[model samples]
Target: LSPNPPKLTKQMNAIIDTVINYKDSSGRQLSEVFIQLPSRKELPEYYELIRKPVDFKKIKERIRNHKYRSLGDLEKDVMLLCHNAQTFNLEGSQIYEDSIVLQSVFKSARQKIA
Candidate 1:
């Protein structure tokens, strides 16, 4: 939760090019909030039911402090998918070792729940 994960919007590539091509910005870096994650309580219960005993309470506490870190995009996407798959735990859904669905999603909070 460094609030500094590299955002990858349409303008992201342009920013990359600007920094690479001697471009100058009017001010400090324009870091933006990209994606958000679920809370520990909201973690998919299906998966939790099978998880090794651990302090989920601590996990939640750490996240509250924005102390948890994320792996870059590829890893984050996989983690999200794992969360999503947990909802389908009745079927034992999980991340496929060879799965290629590590893309991201964009939506408002309301839209996401709906």
Candidate 2:
């Protein structure tokens, strides 16, 4: 959504590049990082013809289920749950796909980063 080249502070810029572009300082692909969210698990429901679709039900469910005692706990739990959900081949239907992954990653990034 940034039209003017995303002129954010240095830290915010780092967040944008990390979550959105999946590129680090060395330009390495951090696609794995973007996949670290529970929303990544839902890909089919996204491309439906539901115009003006802005609300996210899956992420709300994750937030509801993601119980933690503290902010740090919340961050850690979310990170682990989402990351594992995206990567856990040992589980069934717990991992996220590409579309969901993108949204979840951006959501997280927007919260604590850009």
Candidate 3:
């Protein structure tokens, strides 16, 4: 599911950039939580908790490297990213709630396109 397919698009970069900065009504961005990888060197516990970890840095890097075949390719990773956070954090915790909000932003952003 993570590998690139053949359907590419030119409009993906700007659209994805807009998704990255999407904020809440109070001007808070939950998307910032995923901007960097939870490093295995310093935070080994993260790898222990969620062996299947994904983050924005890798996603953006994938976009930069032309590894994303279509906008849907990026969408898949963002979904996985939010799901991972929700799974790893407690349901009542800030990150869990933030993940829910961030997930909505991702979907709504996709809605504007297709």
**Candidate numbers, best TM-score first, in rank order:** 3, 2, 1
The all-Cα superposition gives candidate 1 an RMSD in Å to the true structure of 14.7
lDDT of model number 2:
0.42
> 1 or 2: which has the higher TM-score?
2
Return the top candidate by TM-score.
Answer: 3
User: Could you tell me the TM-score of candidate 2?
Assistant: 0.26
Residue-level lDDT of model 2, residues 1-114, one tens digit each, is 222222333433344354546544565554543333234247544334222222223323333444222334334433544454344333444235543454466567757753
True lDDT of residue 96, candidate 3 = 88
How do the residues 71-107 of candidate 3 rate in per-residue lDDT, one tens digit apiece?
Answer: 7777888888888898888898988898787777777
Of 1 and 3, the candidate ranking higher by lDDT:
3
The C-alpha local distance difference test score for the whole of candidate 1 amounts to 0.32
Worst 10 residues of 3 by lDDT: 1-10
Number of backbone collisions per candidate:
0, 3, 0
Off by over 4 Å in 2: 1-12, 20-96
- Which portions of model 1 miss their true places by more than 4 Å? 1-49, 52-63, 70-103, 106-114
* All candidates: TM-score: 0.22, 0.26, 0.81
Clashes in model 2: which pairs? 40-96, 40-97, 41-96
* Model 1 weakest 10-residue run by lDDT: 97-106
Q: Give the number of the best model, judged by lDDT.
A: 3
Query: In model 2, how large is the Cα lDDT of residue 28?
Result: 58
